[PDB]
Amino acid sequence: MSYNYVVTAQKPTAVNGCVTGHFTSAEDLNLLIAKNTRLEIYVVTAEGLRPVKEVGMYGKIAVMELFRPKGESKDLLFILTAKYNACILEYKQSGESIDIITRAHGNVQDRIGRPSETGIIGIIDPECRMIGLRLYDGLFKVIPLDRDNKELKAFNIRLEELHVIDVKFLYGCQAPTICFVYQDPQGRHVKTYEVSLREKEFNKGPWKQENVEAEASMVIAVPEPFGGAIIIGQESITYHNGDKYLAIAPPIIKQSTIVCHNRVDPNGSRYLLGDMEGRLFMLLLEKETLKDLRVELLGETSIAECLTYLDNGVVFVGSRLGDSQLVKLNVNEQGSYVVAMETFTNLGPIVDMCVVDLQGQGQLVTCSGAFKEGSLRIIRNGIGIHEHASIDLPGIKGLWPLRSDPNRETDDTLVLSFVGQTRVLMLNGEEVEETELMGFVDDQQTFFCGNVAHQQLIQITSASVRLVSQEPKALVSEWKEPQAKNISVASCNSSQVVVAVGRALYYLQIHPQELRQISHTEMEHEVACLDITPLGLSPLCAIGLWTDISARILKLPSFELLHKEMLGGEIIPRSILMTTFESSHYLLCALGDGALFYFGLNIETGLLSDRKKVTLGTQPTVLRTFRSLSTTNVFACSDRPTVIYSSNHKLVFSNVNLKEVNYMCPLNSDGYPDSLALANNSTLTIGTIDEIQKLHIRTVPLYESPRKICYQEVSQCFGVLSSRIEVQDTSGTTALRPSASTQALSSSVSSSFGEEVEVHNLLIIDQHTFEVLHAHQFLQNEYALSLVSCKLGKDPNTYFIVGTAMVYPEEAEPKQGRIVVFQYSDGKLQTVAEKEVKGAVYSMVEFNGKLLASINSTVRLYEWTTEKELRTECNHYNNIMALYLKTKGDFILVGDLMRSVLLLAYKPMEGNFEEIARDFNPNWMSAVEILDDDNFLGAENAFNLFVCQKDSATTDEERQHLQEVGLFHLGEFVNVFCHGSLVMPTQGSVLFGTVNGMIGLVTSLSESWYNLLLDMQNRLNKVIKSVGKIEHSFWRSFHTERKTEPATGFIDGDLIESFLDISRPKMQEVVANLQYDDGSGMKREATADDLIKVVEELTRIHWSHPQFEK
Amino acid sequence: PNIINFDTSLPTSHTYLGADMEEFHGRTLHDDDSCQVIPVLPQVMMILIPGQTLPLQLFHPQEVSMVRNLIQKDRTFAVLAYSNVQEREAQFGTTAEIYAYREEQDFGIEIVKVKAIGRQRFKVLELRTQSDGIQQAKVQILPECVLPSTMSAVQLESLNKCQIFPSKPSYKWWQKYQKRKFHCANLTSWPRWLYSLYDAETLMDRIKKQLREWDENDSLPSNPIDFSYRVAACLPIDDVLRIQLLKIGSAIQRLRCELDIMNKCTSLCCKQCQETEITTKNEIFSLSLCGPMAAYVNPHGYVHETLTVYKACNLNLIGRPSTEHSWFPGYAWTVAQCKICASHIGWKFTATKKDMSPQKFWGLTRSALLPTIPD
Ligand SMILES: COc1ccc(N)c2c1C(=O)N([C@H]1CCC(=O)NC1=O)C2=O
């Protein structure tokens, strides 16, 4: 709508910079990692990395460099942002409190200036006299590092050379000297300049080298004693100094493009180099003075954005296209080699994504990474279970923990029931071994067993209720039905047992070596389930009806009904449970259709104080109590496992990350402490529940570029468009490595210097096993662009529809392309239909049982006939290329790369399209989405979001014009927008995937909510300490290099959620004169507790963020 | 065909106007998106494009007094792109700045000869007419959309050093340029070849390929803003297509539209007939430095955007060749009308010396022609 709330669900994962130094203390070696708007600070240890502090910034970090000025005991941190916010930071720790203070700050942007082609460059000279910034062509900015330059005042020296590729400060010079690579009409060259500190100008440099390699792109300043510079290009690496010049063109780096580097040692004898293909090299400077350079190939890492040598042969690989890593360089007996120690998840670039459902708890599947790093990432929230042991034992129908040692408080036995059978397993640490319990019978299926009062063990089965002694280990007493009839349902605690035979509930009581039957009342209808949990003697007892279909609570040992709630419906109940959640007693009840009804309870009253019902699953739920920390929780065993827990005295149900758990019990074994035993049709698992709910991500490596994804629920699989790079072979093409499209179970083809070629495929990946079931290879030079999975017309089949383009290097605009209709039937992909179009099919969307396709500048609508063919119905010749297509009902939102938004309406009685409204604003656009019939979201340059709406409306010009109602600088580049609910004042949910791997959520607010949160933001901005002292409003302002307007129509949820982290008195400063609306228009003075409840509920709309610091 | 014995710089000088005029070089530009009140010349009907020269002759005392006081100020007037010429309805326009001026007072007849140039596009807010008949427009300054690279946002910092590519000496070079300039296209949803369709440098080169056919004799601008305006002033299109080209804010959208017109519109017919083919794109040639079409003023102050072609068909020649006020010194003009509807389509130009080349060409006025997509 006109009022939106944008919040981060997953912080950016891609790494754009990493530095080492002594930031946290002069004695600590730190690893600083930049993730766009975040800064992670680690302490490098002999074991691995130790997370100490992570800070967010109101800016995209463009320069991050550590330096040590004279007088300073440890390093300082220079940060420059994309919006030119420069700052000097100091790490201060006092006991357990950590603070990043701002030593200096200021904006170093110029009024006029042409930002350079190779972007911002920030360098610091070895003496720490100044910071050199190359922001614009023809200028070199210098910030003196004087103790009193706290506003980071700078001066500009004019650079004659306009196109500088890279610039560094040289080591061992008489004065600060820059070395740079530049390009002019007569070639690419290297040059130096001394910076006159008095004249504030350039002076003739010590050396210069014209006509260096045409592709030289990197300057490396070599430290003393050698000094000088190393220039890296495409086929060669050169060394330069006053009189020396070295040049090598090794074959090993011939097919490589080096993109990153790192000095291994202080004397600069060794360097690490990374190429676009993931190869890691070692550059060696061989002394005789400097005699020669040598390149050695170490191995393969993730495609590196940045490398940083830590210590002890450990190197940090920072990746943007794949997972980041910690690699150990194990290199005389062998050549130099690399071995991966640790991998860190990177979801970016998210080029496409879809939502799978599966209640609102859905999975998010992304098309992440590029090239060899390409993959699918399945992202789901919920409780993780660490599995410790697995036992193959099918048909388990119940589980019970036991302590067969009265002297020990730990459980040592697991009793499992089977159809007409009972088995007992003994635990000795991590050694499970099947045994026989002296006193328990294997003949019968156990309904309940465990530890009972007076050092005994009970075993309620279909035949009898056997009391067994612990020390003698024998059956001290036994209870059977007075007429030998089998027990239908059974409940028990430590002091009492309540067996139910058909519809007659006999209430026995546990006594030393005896089972004295107290009562035997017969209920009206049959007994389906019961519970006697104490809230140790229980005066109350729950019961479920077999005939009446109701839940009633009876008294004990009186049998008189205190409450008889008629549940209703036709499905009989499965389980009943009484439990205390946050000192508020409740009585949950599961139905035969996975329906969890929950009512309140009183220890003396016994009345129902709640009527809520949450849908758990399809299969009936088995409720089981277990202690988590100091409180009790309930595990729901259904077709989808769940955990019931009280939060703020209101019941909460969290999903468990397991496929199917039919039975469970809490286990506290010596080898498995504070663990649980889960059981399914064929397996018994012993596991531990994860301390705190975190995101569970599953990586499916493809080893090629995934481009598009769609979910086909009927086929229980995903359709993924992907491409792989192949090189022209001598024996006239061949692939560089095996990938998803070359390792498919079944494969089809469309037909029967080292120059690259793009082979496009359609993969059918299984949704449970993630195996490549099939790979259809498209035509030679055919580029697959769009993908849909849908039912069309009157045809019941579900198809995978692909839109392609024919790509010829000699033809600029695409003149041919096609729409292929595929069917994934049985185990193979079949081409049902093919439709030849005269252009590129950039987008496709299922439109009311018809196919809406955008070919070139045309929006064509196709009907799917009974002859299984796509027959054209209508066209729309737009003056723009139909790149983006989104639909809502009979509405169409067309968009092009230049932010030309056009709104169309399909007129059914006319068979054509009617253009409704248009807004043309020239700017680069990367994504569009429809929020409602009136409002439309989009992502535009530079890293912004916008919202436009159809006005509402007196004149035809007002109706036909979209008004810009929302502007916001997000800081991310959105590639995909998609409606979807991932979690169980915010209406609607739109998710977005970004280049940096950040996933965000945009939702609608009312005008009242937007106004309250907008005041709250302005009050929060006066309390929140900002790293680098950047204003939040400056950061969020809509930004392009030409213009900057404030943010409107968007509430920053990342800022609103920070209210929860401020001091109690600061919370009252923020809410001092706010007007809290309690659904009546009657505003009052808002309190801290009112906004705690409001903001806390806002955090429940998206995935929670993990704690960085240990 | 070849241009021999003809100084292609002559038509650009507007020598028919007379003796050397006083020159002015102090440029004046208004802040983008500002509301200014600029005077409008009453008889001017033309649709001006920034960077385009407008030659004028003013005889009326209200027109003369207007320019006389205009020279003493910002030397700027408003040229309206009238949607309805008879109804005087205009929604957009271009400011024209006088760079050359000459007053004549021979025989007590006051005449003002000016050479103005298009500067800024704008939107009309209101058109109030003053006592001297001269209109004064309430004008909102339209801005020129300067756009960075498509990769200037996604492009990774490690692949930043590959943005500058070595000198262009060639399909293999353009194949290499695309793969390097749009390398970080793999981080987005689109292919590099798509980004190429919105790349100003590639689009300018594609236009340069067809502009070289018209002028087979590298004198075009480097700036995509200046290049798209130079190409717009040469395209002989209908007034409606010209107002749409003038409405465009970005150089990339402008360059793309111009390429579309150049590929699609290859035939020129009589605007009144729509049943008579006057000429084809194959005949268009640049006899001037500005291109194949420029504005010139006649002896009565009427401006004609004249397109020069090698061959014209279905035209009847009326009158006898005259060198009076000739816009191409060394050539004589003869009025040429459509053989079907007698509309004045333009003139046939004839060389006066046997050593000249081409010996005969045609100047067709834009207001008389209509570009047609043949099928
Ligand atoms: C009513 O129009 C007239 C009337 C008289 C007249 N002497 C001319 C025109 C007229 O349009 N021209 C054009 C012809 C082409 C040219 O090269 N230069 C011109 O100025 C005249 O010369």
Ligand SMILES: [Zn+2]
């Ligand atoms: Zn005609």
